Design a protein around this ligand. Structure first.
Ligand SMILES: O=c1[nH]c(=O)n([C@@H]2O[C@H](CO)[C@@H](O)[C@H](O)[C@H]2O)cc1F
Ligand SMILES: O=c1[nH]c(=O)n([C@@H]2O[C@H](CO)[C@@H](O)[C@H](O)[C@H]2O)cc1F
Lengths: 807, 807
């Protein structure tokens, strides 16, 4: 049907069909008369998977022969989403499978909706890991994703009377056709025990053994016949009341049972620390094993790169020391040189509550050898500080990996900087903040370690896959090469005055909005006007992200309609979606406020279809693939300095939404690429927030001087949005008034005014669309292909390659 | 190579080979250079499984069309063993696969050794279920095995310093290629709650829900293209600290985690009762569902047969009442008629400690509605007794399903008799004992319910599969038809004086003994003379089975050698094997005694290679397939009246071992078939045991009057077999002397003397072999094909059929 979805060869369609029937019969053990759509999805999934394995086997053997440097991406999160369409896209099978299934009398699109998301992550950090693997494979890097195969991913979100309800995400109920269990590569991981000192060194003894069993998932590059591997570890009990002893095996296997659902919040639970060690211990053994199959650890760093996705796998550092010193008997200094040269650290946040700070009493019990190694790392590190800044005792307490207090803690960030040759932030403003604020001391000591690597998203999933209409019209004008070289979108800049392109861009947007409006009605009985502006904020619910600021605007528009009902307003559908961490009380209250606003606004007859507020339930990767292409306005309104980068922002820029946002994270670079005129910037810059903090933030001041704001607060307090529970929202008002760490009132005025400028441009479809084109055309920098090329050249020391392997 | 293993067609071998390579590549994702033997086994297993599915699908559809009466075999145990060779045998693929793998440069036999046993049973009762499914399929019955898919089967037995050690049997570590998960047929099972009474009837409410997910395993008939189904249920938590709530899902799923390892011993644990209800509830829903796809329950019994394998699924009876009365709203009497006409009960033991007697307080909490139904069943039943035997109040307490006492108990056997149209024992002597002793009352009330169905074993696994040499030489003389009509072995009786047959029978036995001797050395470093008589006792360790009697004989031979070293004795290798239930202290002591005897006897230089005592570790189905064909002497020495049938006994008769045994269980019928002259019978009959009990059993009497016995006891007490722990065996001696329920001393004299008659016949190879031939020739009755034909015609009301379905 459409050009970018590849060829439907006569030979190929016939082959796809007969293999589909072979799998329905032999793999699923069904005939055409009893098969349900789920059987059909599985038969297709098994058919497409057959096209991978040849390439998978060839790619792994090719690395064995050429022995290139290997990249190891360690992450507790891999937010993968669905695999089927992504695989078809990267293999050029999409039209072929469309044809093949059509001739069998099936709809491939309704088959794709049966696949469960692999929701093995929380949000941005997890999804960055997924975009990264795709880009690494597309760039021919000999790269491995390593993580935990969680039995339960992020919870499924239900809304009940406006409140979030959590359900276990049982994503493996029906099997996962994409993975291959490799029980033959199972490895022991140790916990507890004690340290013995002998003549020939320290010995870690009397340990509890948990087995790590690997599952391999293929990761295909874009049309280059490279298939890399994501290896995920599962916890298994070793084989040594009888009944009770058998039942208690589930204690050891609980390690890989469930993903922790905090995003941007640290929780010091033991099961979490076990998870962190488990992935690090099993992975390092695998890494070392692979290195020995090609005595001499001097070359280790020329053969191995280990990237740490936040501090979650920070134990990689003392684990590598442990193996090198205790088991391989290298001296301390030589082992330490290998370690630093091997490891690199990526920071994703500056929020203090998000940083991992592990109680010494936990590490002592669980990992007594690792604590000793850490104390020694600390002593030697602090001796370098003392030597470089003599007499500066304050520096020494600030820089210590050990934080003193009523409970002693290890600062895992400090550990990562000390044991890594490179530390990077994820956007230029965020990397600057690291050097000026929380890592200033470390930067002054080792300025060469600090780098920027601005985040990116994959144009395969985030354009070609979710938005075939837009990719198609682009390909008509400029060709197909941009899919793996997103800088070429800049050519689109010569079509900004082209009348036919303007209509085509606007046509695709209208189509996406129609389709999504129909999805809202069918799957959720929700009833929206597709001619309204689609105002969307989707991301995890967190105070720093300021869904509340969005809420206040929404209430302002409603109060403006009620004051002057017969006046023209540009109609909006305001959509807010995201999950709250189960124990984050405020976050849960925010969700309830949003639905409470919808209860009132959506059933007011005076409003009409001019204002709708929808809470988008169970936001996840596969929902983002649907709502992003449908969006007109992208909301990125975090208090300046708090959002390290953002990646949703890039997804929307790429898909023809305009951005309203603060000068925060990657927003700064997007606006710089598109031109500030083509972006709706508002609010405090980082410098302004700083000024407000020195002086003191008094929210009362904004309440006294802004009648429209006062009215909103009065409505919240008086029970206007909760008639049965008049005092339901007193926590929010109290917080907004007395301890708002994120200064929601300070940006309110400039936000509302900036929002009027958006409504104004939207009244002029032609000028709206030309601004869209200028965004899309300059979104090229935000390809994860660019990001990974920079990691490769500036951190890992490997050259990317766009060359095809043969089939 | 050999005729009974089928054709190796040129077309077939070429096809098997290319499918093997397809699975190695696409299913296992390996190339010929990295594959291990386990990969090779899996590729073969996936290839052979492809030949089943066509037939599997056709068989299930054929039943849908013809709508025959369905047989439902309910069992908590299915002792399956390995599936690969059995599948090849039943499909005639064995030579073809042998050729195909050979040409690929593989040894099929070493590939077969990689398959784990499905050890989903304890011993005899579990294995009878497995033989039954094979026979049902071979006889074209529309039959379903229903049970629990245990995550851990019977424990793996390790011997450490002579003591049993238990290891979790993790049989699914590497996957099970034979099963097909059917998550689409998942069903809710209820526990706890309470009973509400309304106007329209009783309602069971506030229940905990556990989900039952089915796994289908194919069961192929012998060369008839029938493939039936064994459906096994797995426990799953429903989807509704967050972390802790997710972790606690393992509480509900524990139901199907582990098989209880007691054989012939009841343990009243709650997890066991949950297991029993779970299989019964999920199965009955499936049964009822299937019946509705073809309102009117009058025809239910013409469409459904439910067989209860012991009392383990006795809850089938009140569950069926519950559904029929509470959910389908039929009146009590009509529902009860349907129930009785549907259900039938098989008893497997008369040992009082083995009978299930469930505390009312457990049933009350766990299954409060079922208890009410049981009380009502009891009341109405006792009214029929009272009416038939007026004034007999004693009968009424004896017959009650409710046993009075300090703790009230439900007698599950009494329930099964009341709710069943047929009750059967498993050998003629056992069925007679039921009518005269423990079920006398019930027999007097309803004499027509009581039947015999003498057990059998499948000649496919138990001859063709494990003993291809013997099957081959039989097929040479009499053809192949006997494999599915074992009565034809009677033709062999005209070869008893044939010189060539005599040499061939003896040749096969020598070959089996050589092979097994080499297995003992390779896998266990054990060092035996293959020219010695192979004296084997293999079965679970239980006092009633009298491994101890065997022990005393062994010690007697040793003391006879030491007394007169230079005298000729027929050399023996005495092999004893079996598992002990983990909490059965005595049973564990017996294992230690056996190895203690081996420690002394095996390293005495005066003994030479004249007497060896070996403990066969980890006895299980796949070990029985090896040792049975190698046996000369089969030991079946249970105290008369205690072994209901036995089935090992039949395995040995079939494979050319002679039997030494008591007139117990099926021993009586075997000796009757072969002629008493061709059997080594000894010891008390049932009548003699009875006489001894009336008088009182005083073991002291045998100790005073038999010097050889006194010497053994003195040796046991003085520490002759335990020099470091002189008093190690005082529990055994104490038991033997003061409270031996099984009268080991009473049979000792006649046992020893009968054992001398065996040594005598063994000195004359020609006459030994002719007696073997007379056993093999009359072992036909003991085919499970005969057994099932009798169940079908006399209990289920269906006609067996030997006719082939088409391929
Ligand atoms: O716990 C975290 N979870 C999370 O998703 N991140 C995000 O990581 C993303 C990837 O770098 C950033 O774009 C984003 O600004 C940042 O909040 C940062 C964390 F620290
Ligand atoms: O718990 C039991 N386990 C067991 O294996 N059985 C056996 O069941 C076999 C099958 O009927 C009989 O041959 C045998 O005599 C009998 O002991 C009987 C029981 F009651």
């Amino acid at each position: 049907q459409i050009s970018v979805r590849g060829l439907a060869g006569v030979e190929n369609v016939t082959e796809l069909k007969k293999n589909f029937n072979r799998h329905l019969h032999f793999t699923l053990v069904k005939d055409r008369n009893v098969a349900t759509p789920r059987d059909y999805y599985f038969a297709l999934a098994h058919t497409v998977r057959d096209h991978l394995v040849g390439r998978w086997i060839r790619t792994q053997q090719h690395y064995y022969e050429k022995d290139p440097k290997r990249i190891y991406y360690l992450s507790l999160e891999f937010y993968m989403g669905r695999t089927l369409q992504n695989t078809m896209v990267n293999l050029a099978l999409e039209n072929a499978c469309d044809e093949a299934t059509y001739q069998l009398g099936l709809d491939m699109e309704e088959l794709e909706e049966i696949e469960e998301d692999a929701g093995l992550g929380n949000g941005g950090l997890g999804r960055l890991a997924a975009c990264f693997l795709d880009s690494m494979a597309t760039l021919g890097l000999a790269a491995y994703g390593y993580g935990i195969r969680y039995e339960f991913g992020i919870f499924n979100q239900k809304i009940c009377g406006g409140w979030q309800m959590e359900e276990a995400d049982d994503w493996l109920r029906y099997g996962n056709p994409w993975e291959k269990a490799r029980p033959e590569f199972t490895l022991p991981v140790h916990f507890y025990g004690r340290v013995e000192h002998t003549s020939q060194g320290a010995k870690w003894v009397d340990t509890q053994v948990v087995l790590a069993m690997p599952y391999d998932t293929p990761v295909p590059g874009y049309r280059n016949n490279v298939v890399n591997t994501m290896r995920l570890w599962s916890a298994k009990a070793p084989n040594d009341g009888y009944i009770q002893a058998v039942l208690d095996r589930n204690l050891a296997e609980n390690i890989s049972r469930v993903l922790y659902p905090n995003d941007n919040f640290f929780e010091g639970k033991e099961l979490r620390l076990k998870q962190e060690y488990f992935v690090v211990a099993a992975t390092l053994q695998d890494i070392i094993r692979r290195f020995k199959s090609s005595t001499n650890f001097d070359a280790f760093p020329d053969k191995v790169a280990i990237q740490l996705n936040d501090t979650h796998p920070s134990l990689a550092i003392p684990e590598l020391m442990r193996v090198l010193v205790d088991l391989e008997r290298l001296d301390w200094d030589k082992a330490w040189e290998v370690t630093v040269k091997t490891c690199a650290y990526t920071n994703h946040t500056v929020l203090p509550e998000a940083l991992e700070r592990w109680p010494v009493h936990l590490l002592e019990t669980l990992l007594p050898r690792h604590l000793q190694i850490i104390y020694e790392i600390n002593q030697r590190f602090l001796n370098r500080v003392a030597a470089a800044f003599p007499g500066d005792v304050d520096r020494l307490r600030r820089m210590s990996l050990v934080e003193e207090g009523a409970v002693k803690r290890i600062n895992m960030a400090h550990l990562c900087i000390a044991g890594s040759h490179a530390v990077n932030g994820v956007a230029r403003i965020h990397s600057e903040i690291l050097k000026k604020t929380i890592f200033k001391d470390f930067y002054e000591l080792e300025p060469h370690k600090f780098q920027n690597k601005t985040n990116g998203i994959t144009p395969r999933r985030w354009l070609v896959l979710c938005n075939p209409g837009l990719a198609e019209i682009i390909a008509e004008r400029i060709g197909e090469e941009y899919i793996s070289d997103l800088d070429q979108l800049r050519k689109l800049l010569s079509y900004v005055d082209d009348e036919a392109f303007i209509r085509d861009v606007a046509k695709v947007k209208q189509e996406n909005k129609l389709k999504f409006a129909a999805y809202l009605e069918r799957e959720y009985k929700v009833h929206i006007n597709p001619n309204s502006l689609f105002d969307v904020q989707v991301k995890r619910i967190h105070e720093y992200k300021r869904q509340l600021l969005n809420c206040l605007h929404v209430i302002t528009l409603y109060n403006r309609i009620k004051k002057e009902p017969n006046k023209f307003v540009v109609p909006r559908t305001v959509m807010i979606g995201g999950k709250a961490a189960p124990g984050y009380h405020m976050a849960k209250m925010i969700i309830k406020l949003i639905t409470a606003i919808g209860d009132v606004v959506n059933h007011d007859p005076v409003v009409g279809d001019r204002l709708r507020v929808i809470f988008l339930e169970n936001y996840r990767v596969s929902l983002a693939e649907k709502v992003i292409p449908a969006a007109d306005l992208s909301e990125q309104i975090s208090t300046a300095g708090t959002e390290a980068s953002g990646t949703g922002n890039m997804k929307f820029m790429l898909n023809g939404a305009l951005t309203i946002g603060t000068m925060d994270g990657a927003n700064v670079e997007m606006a710089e690429e598109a031109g500030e005129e083509n972006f709706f910037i508002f609010g405090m810059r980082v410098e302004d927030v700083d000024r407000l903090d020195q002086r003191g933030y008094n929210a009362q001041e904004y309440y006294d001087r802004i009648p429209e704001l006062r009215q909103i607060i009065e409505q919240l307090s008086s029970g206007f949005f909760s008639p049965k529970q008049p005092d339901l929202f007193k926590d929010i008002v109290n917080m907004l008034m007395h301890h708002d760490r994120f200064k929601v009132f300070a940006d309110y005025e400039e936000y509302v005014k900036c929002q009027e400028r958006v409504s104004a441009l939207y009244k002029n479809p032609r000028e709206w669309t030309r601004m869209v084109i200028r965004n899309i055309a300059t979104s090229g920098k935000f390809s994860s292909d660019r990001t990974i090329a920079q990691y490769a050249r500036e951190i890992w020391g490997v050259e990317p390659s766009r060359q095809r392997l043969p089939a």
